[PDB]
Paper text:
To establish whether mutations T325S and Y334C alter the structure of SepSecS, we solved crystal structures of holo T325S and the T325S-tRNASec and Y334C-tRNASec complexes. The binary complex crystals belonged to the trigonal space group and contained two SepSecS dimers and one tRNASec molecule in the asymmetric unit, whereas those of the holo T325S were of the orthorhombic space group with half of the SepSecS tetramer in the asymmetric unit. On the other hand, Thr325 is located in helix α12 and ~15Å away from the active site. We hypothesized that the insertion of Ser in position 325 could introduce a kink in α12, thereby altering both the orientation of PLP and the overall conformation of the active site in human SepSecS4. Inspection of the initial Fo-Fc electron density difference maps confirmed that Thr325 was substituted with Ser in the T325S variant and that Tyr334 was replaced with Cys in Y334C. A closer inspection of the crystal structure revealed that the Thr325 → Ser replacement does not cause any changes in the tetrameric structure of SepSecS. Based on these observations, we conclude that pathogenic mutations Thr325Ser and Tyr334Cys do not alter the three-dimensional structure of the SepSecS tetramer. The WT enzyme has a Tm value of 70.6 ± 1.0 °C. While the tetrameric T325S70 and Y334C70 have Tm values that are lower by ~5 °C with T325S70 having a Tm value of 65.0 ± 0.8 °C and Y334C70 having Tm of 64.6 °C ± 0.0 °C. In contrast, because only a small fraction of the T325S variant co-purifies with GroEL, it is likely the least damaging of the pathogenic variants. In contrast to the A239T variant, T325S contains a significant proportion of tetramers, and its fraction that co-elutes with GroEL is capable of adopting a tetrameric structure over time.
O-phosphoseryl-tRNASec:selenocysteinyl-tRNASec synthase (SepSecS; SEPSECS) is an ubiquitously expressed enzyme that catalyzes the terminal reaction of selenocysteine synthesis. SepSecS converts the phosphoseryl (Sep) group into the selenocysteinyl (Sec) moiety in a mechanism that requires selenocysteine tRNA (tRNASec) and a pyridoxal-5-phosphate (PLP) cofactor. Previous structural work has shown that SepSecS is an obligate tetramer held by interactions between two homodimers. Recently, two research groups reported that four distinct mutations in human SEPSECS caused congenital cerebellar atrophy termed pontocerebellar hypoplasia type 2D (PCH2D).
Author numbering:
A (entry chain B), B (entry chain B), C (entry chain A), D (entry chain A): 19 to 462
Write the structure that this text describes.
Amino acid sequence: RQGCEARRSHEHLIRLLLEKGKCPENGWDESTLELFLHELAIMDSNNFLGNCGVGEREGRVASALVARRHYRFIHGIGRSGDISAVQPKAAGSSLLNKITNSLVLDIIKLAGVHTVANCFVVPMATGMSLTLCFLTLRHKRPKAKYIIWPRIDQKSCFKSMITAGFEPVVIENVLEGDELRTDLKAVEAKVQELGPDCILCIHSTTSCFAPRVPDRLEELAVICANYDIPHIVNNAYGVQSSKCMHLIQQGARVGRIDAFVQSLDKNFMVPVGGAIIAGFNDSFIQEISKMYPGRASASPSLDVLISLLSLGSNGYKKLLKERKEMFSYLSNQIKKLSEAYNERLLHTPHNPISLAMTLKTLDEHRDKAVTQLGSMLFTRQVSGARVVPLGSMQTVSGYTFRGFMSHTNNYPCAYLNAASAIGMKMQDVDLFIKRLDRCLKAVR
Amino acid sequence: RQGCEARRSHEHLIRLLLEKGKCPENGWDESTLELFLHELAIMDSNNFLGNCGVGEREGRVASALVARRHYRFIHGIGRSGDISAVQPKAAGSSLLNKITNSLVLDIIKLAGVHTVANCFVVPMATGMSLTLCFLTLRHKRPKAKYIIWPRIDQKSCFKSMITAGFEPVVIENVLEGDELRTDLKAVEAKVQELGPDCILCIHSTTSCFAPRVPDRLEELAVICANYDIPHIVNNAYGVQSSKCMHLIQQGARVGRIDAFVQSLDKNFMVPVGGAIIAGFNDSFIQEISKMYPGRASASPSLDVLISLLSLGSNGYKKLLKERKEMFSYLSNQIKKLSEAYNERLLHTPHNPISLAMTLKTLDEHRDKAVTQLGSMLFTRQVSGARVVPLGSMQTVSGYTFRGFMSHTNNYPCAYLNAASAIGMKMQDVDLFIKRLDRCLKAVR
Amino acid sequence: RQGCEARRSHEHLIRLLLEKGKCPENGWDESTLELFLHELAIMDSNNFLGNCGVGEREGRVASALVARRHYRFIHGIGRSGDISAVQPKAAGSSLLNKITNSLVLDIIKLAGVHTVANCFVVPMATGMSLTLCFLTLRHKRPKAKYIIWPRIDQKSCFKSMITAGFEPVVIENVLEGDELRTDLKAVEAKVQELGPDCILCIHSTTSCFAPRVPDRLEELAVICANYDIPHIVNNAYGVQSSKCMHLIQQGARVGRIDAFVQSLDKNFMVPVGGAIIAGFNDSFIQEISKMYPGRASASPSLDVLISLLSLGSNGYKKLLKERKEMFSYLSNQIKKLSEAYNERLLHTPHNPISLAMTLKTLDEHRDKAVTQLGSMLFTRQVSGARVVPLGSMQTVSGYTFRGFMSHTNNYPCAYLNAASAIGMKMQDVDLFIKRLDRCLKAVR
Amino acid sequence: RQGCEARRSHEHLIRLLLEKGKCPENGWDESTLELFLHELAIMDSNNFLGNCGVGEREGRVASALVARRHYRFIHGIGRSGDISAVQPKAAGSSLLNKITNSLVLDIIKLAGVHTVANCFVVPMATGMSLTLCFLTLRHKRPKAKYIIWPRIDQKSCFKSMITAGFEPVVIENVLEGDELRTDLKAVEAKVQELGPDCILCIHSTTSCFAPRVPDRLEELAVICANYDIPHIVNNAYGVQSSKCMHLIQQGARVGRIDAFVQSLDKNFMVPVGGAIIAGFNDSFIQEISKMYPGRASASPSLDVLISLLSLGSNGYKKLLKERKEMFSYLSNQIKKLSEAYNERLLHTPHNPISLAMTLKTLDEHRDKAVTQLGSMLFTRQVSGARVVPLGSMQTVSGYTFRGFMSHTNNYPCAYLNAASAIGMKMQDVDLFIKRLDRCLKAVR
Ligand SMILES: *Cc1c(COP(=O)(O)O)cnc(C)c1O
Ligand SMILES: *Cc1c(COP(=O)(O)O)cnc(C)c1O
Ligand SMILES: *Cc1c(COP(=O)(O)O)cnc(C)c1O
Ligand SMILES: *Cc1c(COP(=O)(O)O)cnc(C)c1O
């Protein structure tokens, strides 16, 4: 009796997801969730009882291990041409995809950009996703050859411009105290020296390693609005930061932001290889969508859908709150640990995720020591702790960087990065701090 | 006693996979396979006991459902810039990826291209994968604007040229009996009318729907070799066909093939969204690899690795043999079924996968009937049976096709497609034939 | 859409199960099966979304891996008063239990005992289930002290009588050709000698190792009926035999059979640990059930339900046909191998499952050759093959057997056992034959 | 590389388990756990790559879903002669069984009975396991006919004596304040009256529903020792109580305790159906084990092994601490709620798990108000909450109880039960309190 009435309780919660398309506040139980997924998957034609297929793409699976791990979703997302089209052979995977995007939109508002208009998950890394942005803009701006780009030493966002077949105009950053920041004069100087006509867009970055900080999106938004140049923001892991997101929201408010791009794995704790393209003008975001040729994996969407339904927005809020606390906590431990070493926490207030500590007391010249500290942390099972020494030469797609990983040619000292990224735990910091200590003692 | 000695038996079979990198002849038991995968996954730093992470990309997972369905592989494939580089934080996923590619190479030889030099799985559809080919060629051929392309009515392979920012030079096909084939005169005519300098490459297609057939790769290979123009073959679902593959092998032999591109889902019965880029010149295939910006999903590779280890090459040989038999069987049933309807099997011998049956006895003009047959098969749970009526106008990225889906502007009659793609079963044909019959009777 | 009409299809198969309680003719698809189970599990109170529990047995599960591997079925079957009883806290578990027993009833009819009245799965193996039968009979026959038992050398069925707290009266078998068959005169003599009121039951055995054969149930059914003594049949792995089953059907037809018991795993290829108790007196089978104190595991019931739902009655029949055929094959092959060694196949026509080959030409007196042969096969990973030398002495629970494993005190010769049990494949026979020959050559 | 040194880490934890047989202090990671299990399962002969089987019990599994959900453990535990015995065909199952019993021994020490000598998991629930105890005692005391049993109203433990084939001698409890406690004088009187040789055992009970409290085991242990009678303790859910456990430890210290039995699920949050039999005479516990006829399910053993390996001893202690605390909380909260309704918390200090609240102010004589209250809570999805009106009459196995569910013939008042059992959360208490108040307001 209370049996089929128990079902209704899960049902109410699924109806709510579909009819409003926002995250649940509290996460779903696994039971509700898997129920939901089986429901969807049986909607796909490959999962019809007594189907017959005489096509070349019938979603036949050879290995039951493969079918089951994908919850029997096989046909991917989109149609032949358009990636945002309801697949006629896959009603269930189409709806998976629709819901997923909707949930992600919901979170992006929740995270600080309450005026975001439209977004979609794309099964590529952030780099290739940025590239798809550029490939779309080419068709809108025939004359353009150049992408203006405030320097940031990440091989993927840089390569994305070159993979799209454009030329990066590398605007160095300005040292303001400890921070490396947008050189607004140099940016406007280039627009004029090259002409709005010849600029594909300005390519800015929020989330980054200190001592760089998030670009001055407000001012760039204004510049772009004025010269009628597209603005594309690399927000790889900025969704988890209130500062980064408000900055984007304020940019949209006073000027022009055409699209911002975020990594799924970095913001949602899922496997690498997916991303979100998002914007404020609905039709442009659709256009980037339609520029994608063919059907794409449904795997990244499924993960994010699974992850958000289990968390609910309250669970994501909790991860965000804890990242903020873990950031303060990591900073204070590094203030304490540095002072003890006559090093200091570099003063980088405009960067809310990443931190840097001086390594001035290390004789890199005589006995490579900054570098020896590098491999030492890796072996001692510390990861994500980046060491940046002086005088790093790296070549990438032909362009040579001087001072690579410091986002500038001559930063005053070598330092060490650490970050409070989402899902970090207090044990992470304490182990890091203890192991760091141990490592320092063995070098100086 | 025979306990730890039982382990050695699985071990021998894993050692064999690694030391030689070819498929097992007979498939592995699931036990060996999952053992193998757990082994690999524990090699990834995110799965180290007592790891600490202070980075922004630590492969943290929020949902255990997500971790487990990916066998705990989280970090994806490649490094920041280069997709073929051993990820230092993911030794296990790097090796997964290496082995996967190696296995796929092994199969491509087994399938008919015994001189293939190098290949790699890429987590994008075939369309975007073709696009990555073009984006790579741009940098090698600065002057090029045009891609010469023997017509084939598939929105994705066509869009791939435009997404890469080039212009498709659409070479119509020549009607030779029932077959639509490469117009070699028109192709060479364009090379000269435009100049080798201005051609990015020739973009040919093997696997396709009848009455088109695989392009004359031999002759095009010669043309491309002569005018020093790159040759890029769309082999979307050709791996499963001995004719298609030998054709590619013969092309490489007498001339120039730079890369050929295949869908994972269509050739290996896995979820959509992945592909294989392959070639004969090692360094070029590496170059396309390095053109990809950022880390990519490891999901498609895992599926193909899982699928091939379970099948072994003998299992794949068996699927291939059965596709050939199911093709004969499907043809004979359609000869019988057509003759009974005063229709006929179109004579399309050079096409080994797809078949077509005349629908001349259908009054599309008066009562849409060809089209009514279309939705009717869909509702009756038949899929992959394509109906192509006369006078189909479709626009795609600006270009309008006249006679769309017939690969020509004025094909002599409407017809119906059916194909023997891999993993098809005799029940598929018989259900198709029965349901087709039922559908015809209700229209004529 | 096509999507929602899809669920309809699976609901149809499920509805049909619930209504008629019969096995599907054709196996269910995994998707339908897992859908079905998820519906059931959400019906247990521990899986309710709003539930709060303040009891001692609330179905709380600590480990997700444990929860998930049992499809979230936690409460077991029954109530502490009866296992046949519906659990108020677990309507889904309760439903699973009823469905299972119903399907199993179906298959017992299918397999040859078309007049079975009642049965139930009990999560104890065949031995303890026989004990549960004797324990029930105790309260029905206060004076009874003895169980009359035609000898079969298997420790579980023998211990069952002692565990139940009764005294086995071992009745020797009578050599007839090569066969060991029931000594009917000796059985009726013991009845007469001890007096019927002192006999708890007669305990017969159908399935058994050659040269023994299924007891003459018809004659025993007659004796039992005439002397008004309970007849309990050990049918551990007789469900897979039309012969054994027909013999039980015949016994019920001509005389008296109170219960027969079968192993879940031996007859249905599920893990060890469950059984089925069946009978013709519905009231009496209910009494054996109600004699069980407390709740019981639902795991074995779940295993068989999954198995029968995936195989369908057609799948199970196929296994039974394949078993018959492998029996002829294994037999012919052993006829052939024995000749080459001047041994022969013992003629045991009345045993449909198990075969015996003479080992008369190995000198166990002079050199363990028989014994060696056993361990030799064991090391070549042949399992099930049983070697029986002359004059084995085994004491079980204080009772000594001469010629243990031969079911008789003095059997003509040493022999080797081999059987065709459900799921055996030709490879099994060929590998066994090849390895036995290699082993025979070694010892000689 | 770092990868191969990784496996080393998990092997270390595994080695430590095998060597010492103790619970890990900190829980295992799933990856280590699943690695471990896979190693074990490949050690069973049914999982051998080269195996051929020609037997009746070869571990063949028809369904992959069944195979996989049991981690490919198929053969069960033991041999048909003894369950403590190593299976030659299943070294991994055999190993799993030994490890499980060892961990469980560890936890029983941990939980308070530090002098336990021996135990084993048996895949029967607590009732049948008590039966297995009486069945063993039969052969040890041929004259014994009676089981002396201080009354506790729970049908499983009562039926266990009857199922075993003995006659319960029900000893009424003595009202002491609000509590029902053992009537020691009446117990010793029955011994004297019936004679020790006619008593199979005395059967006491620790865990139980308030107002009953754990039997005075110390006094009973003394009596039992003096009169040389076996003492069997029903400890169904007492492992989670330091009090109940200390009381068993004390009884063993001062007098005689032959075995005590506990439920797997009630004490370890695994599914229903398993139990643990433990004692201080190692030889005697071995006899209870060897009295089991045949192979048994390994599922319950697997559940607890997974559970204890994931929790670790630290995890289990945390659950026990949380249970104590929720008891105070639930108690204070019930003290508060009762006052508002002019009811009181019955004073039952000696019962550490279960609480009782008076329902003296509801007129069950006039209007089912007590009974209504029960069904009312049931519909608001409160489970475990038990309502006990005055003068309930229940006949179990032909024995009639007055005031059934109250453990006495005439208890002062109707009351409501609530318990803090392992895994209870504050939400449980708050939801129960809120809903009980809403239900109390309704009835009045
Ligand atoms: C499948 C296929 C493609 C690739 O399509 P995607 O959806 O991008 O994988 C291209 N051309 C043809 C003819 C195809 O069949
Ligand atoms: C992660 C990240 C990217 C994107 O890298 P992918 O590997 O392509 O996802 C780009 N720029 C920065 C600063 C990043 O942190
Ligand atoms: C749980 C319980 C039992 C055992 O019940 P089963 O259903 O057989 O596991 C026995 N006595 C008491 C007091 C119990 O609470
Ligand atoms: C299998 C078998 C049994 C039952 O053995 P269990 O291990 O208790 O399941 C009983 N008698 C015979 C002849 C058997 O083969």
